[PDB]
Amino acid sequence: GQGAAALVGGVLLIGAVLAGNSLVCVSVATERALQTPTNSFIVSLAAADLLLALLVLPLFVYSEVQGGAWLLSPRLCDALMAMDVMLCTASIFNLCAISVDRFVAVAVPLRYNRQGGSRRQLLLIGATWLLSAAVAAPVLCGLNDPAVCRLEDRDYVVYSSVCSFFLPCPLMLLLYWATFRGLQRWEVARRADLEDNWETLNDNLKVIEKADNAAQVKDALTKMRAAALDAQKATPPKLEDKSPDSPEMKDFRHGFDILVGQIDDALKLANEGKVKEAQAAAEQLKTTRNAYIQKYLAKITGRERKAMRVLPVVVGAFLLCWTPFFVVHITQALCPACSVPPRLVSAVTWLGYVNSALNPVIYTVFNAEFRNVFRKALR
């Protein structure tokens, strides 16, 4: 009765965690549009969820069929609980790492000399996992004084409730808040104008790629030049009060000067009838914007802020799913006499674990790139 619901519910939960989260990892692996700094953390979150389904949920379900009785070794129980605590902590610490990472990307504009990221996200992810293991490590040493698998050490439970949850949460919330406000300060008033300029650039690079002749190339380059110059005049509020002589204003203007200079050289070539050379100059121009310009066009048009919309939904769902769990557990640990109904302890646990099945759904619905890869699984 109570056992059959756990079994069916558990097999369905485990199936849904493995299915959804493997499809996330494979998608980041197969689709170039998904290989971003942010999605490195999303893969880390997927790993945490896959590991939960592999290492924790099966014996959790088995436990639930036995009505919470634990018939196996007490050392195995300790091993399970330490893994339980670590994976929970790792999910939270990774949501925290995202907000730290995104705040820094926003607050600290950097341009590298060489190809690729710094892999600082990977280092931060490594740090996140080692920190989660550090929080969980004492559980492995055996904290209990029976036939059930529970954390009975009240000081440990309060400690981890605070470190793993009640402390990261407000800080994470403050950081997401600062991050979103930071980006907004970069978004120009005349968004649609700058989007037009941006489309002119991309549409005409494609016209150039397939041109029949030099005049088409020259016409396309001429439009690009005008759009580059317009875009150059779209100043973000972030730099509005910055003087014309400011080294941050001198930066801004410069990226567009390099661009206009490249367009001019391609123009000279097209004008002389050198189609292939003009097309190569323009392709070489698809790489100068690939880093210097386009990164911060997505920023100043509001695209970047829009693409971050999936993150609060993920954070939100995590808070909905785990807040009841941590309120129940810290209460019990602080106040033995504050009796929580066992059926509710069971409920908030399942609620916590079902979070692990939710993120793949959240990405599919609320993020455009993920939604896109998904919707072309119609093959």
Ligand X SMILES: CCCCCCCC/C=C/CCCCCCCC(=O)O
Q: Please, which residue, 96 or 217, has the CB nearer to Na ion?
A: 96
The smaller minimum CB distance to ligand AQD, of residues 81 and 224, is found at 81
Region from 148-156, 260-268, 275-283, 333-341 binding ligand X, contact rule CB under 6 A? 333-341
**What number of other Cβ atoms are within 10 A of residue 124's Cβ?**
21
Kindly state whether residue 167 participates in binding ligand X, applying the rule CB under 6 A. yes
Which of 6, 28, 53, 81 binds ligand AQD (CB under 6 A)? It is: 81
Stretch near ligand X under the rule CB under 6 A, chosen from 70-78, 161-169, 253-261, 262-270: 161-169
- HSE at residue 291, side-chain half, CA atoms within 13 A, is 12
Report CA-CA distances (Å) from 296 to 234, 328, 341. Answer: 12, 45, 53
**Residue 91 site contact among ligand X, ligand AQD, Na ion, none (CB < 5 to 8 Å, cut-off depends on kind):** Na ion
Q: Does 34 bind ligand AQD (CB under 6 A)?
A: no
Min dist CB 58 to Na ion, Å, is 16
SS3 336: coil
Contacts (CB under 6 A) with ligand X, residues 210-239: none
- Residue 144: CB minimum distance to ligand AQD, A: 11
Contact status: 56 vs ligand X (CB under 6 A): no
Is residue 346 involved in binding ligand X (CB under 6 A)? yes
Minimum distance between the CB of residue 364 and Na ion, rounded to whole angstroms?
17
Residue 43, CA distances (Å) to 81, 91, 268, 308, 329 in order: 23, 11, 47, 16, 29
Which residue among 104, 349, 350, 374 contacts ligand AQD (CB under 6 A)?
349
Of the candidates 143, 32, 129, the one whose C-alpha atom is nearest the C-alpha of residue 81 is: 143
Q: Does 262 bind ligand AQD (CB under 6 A)?
A: no
From 6, 48, 278, 362, residue interacting with Na ion (rule: CB under 5 A) = 48
Q: How far is the CB of 49 from Na ion (least distance, A)?
A: 5
CB atoms within 10 A of CB 345: 15
Closest CA to 46 of 80, 14, 15, 23: 23
Longest dimension (CA), the chain: 89
Binding mask 10-29 for Na ion (x = CB under 5 A): --------------------
Contact 305, 184 (CB under 8 A): yes
| Residue 301 binds which of ligand X, Na ion, ligand AQD, none (CB < 5-8 A, kind-dependent) | none
Strand partners, 148: 69
Long-range contacts of 311-314 (CB under 8 A, 24+ apart): 311/38, 311/98, 311/99, 311/102, 311/176, 312/176, 313/362, 313/366, 314/45, 314/95, 314/359, 314/362
Q: Which of 67, 59, 64, 74 is nearest to 145 (CA)?
A: 74
Closest distance to Na ion from the beta carbon of 18 (Å): 13
Candidates 257, 246, 311; CA nearest to 106 is 311
CB 274 within 8 A of CB 221: no
Exactly one of 143, 298, 327, 340 binds ligand X (CB under 6 A); which one? 327
168 near ligand X, judged by CB under 6 A: yes
The option from Na ion, ligand X, ligand AQD, none interacting with 320 (CB < 5 to 8 A, set by class) reads ligand X
Binding residues for ligand AQD restricted to 316-345, rule: CB under 6 A? 329
Q: Does 149 bind ligand AQD (CB under 6 A)?
A: yes
Segments in the chain forming alpha helices (H): 2-30, 37-55, 57-65, 74-107, 120-136, 154-160, 168-184, 191-209, 214-232, 247-271, 275-283, 285-288, 294-300, 303-307, 310-334, 342-366, 368-375
The full DSSP string for 140-159 is: GG------B-----HHHHHH
Q: How many residues bind ligand AQD (CB under 6 A)?
A: 19
The three-class DSSP label of residue 346 is: helix
Q: Which residue is nearest to ligand X (CB)?
A: 316
Residue 367 binding ligand X, by CB under 6 A:
no
Exactly one of 130, 320, 344, 368 binds ligand X (CB under 6 A); which one?
320
Which CB sits closer to ligand AQD, 164 or 262? 164
Contacts with ligand AQD by CB under 6 A lie at: 56, 59-60, 63, 80-81, 84-85, 88-89, 149-151, 157, 160-161, 164, 329, 349
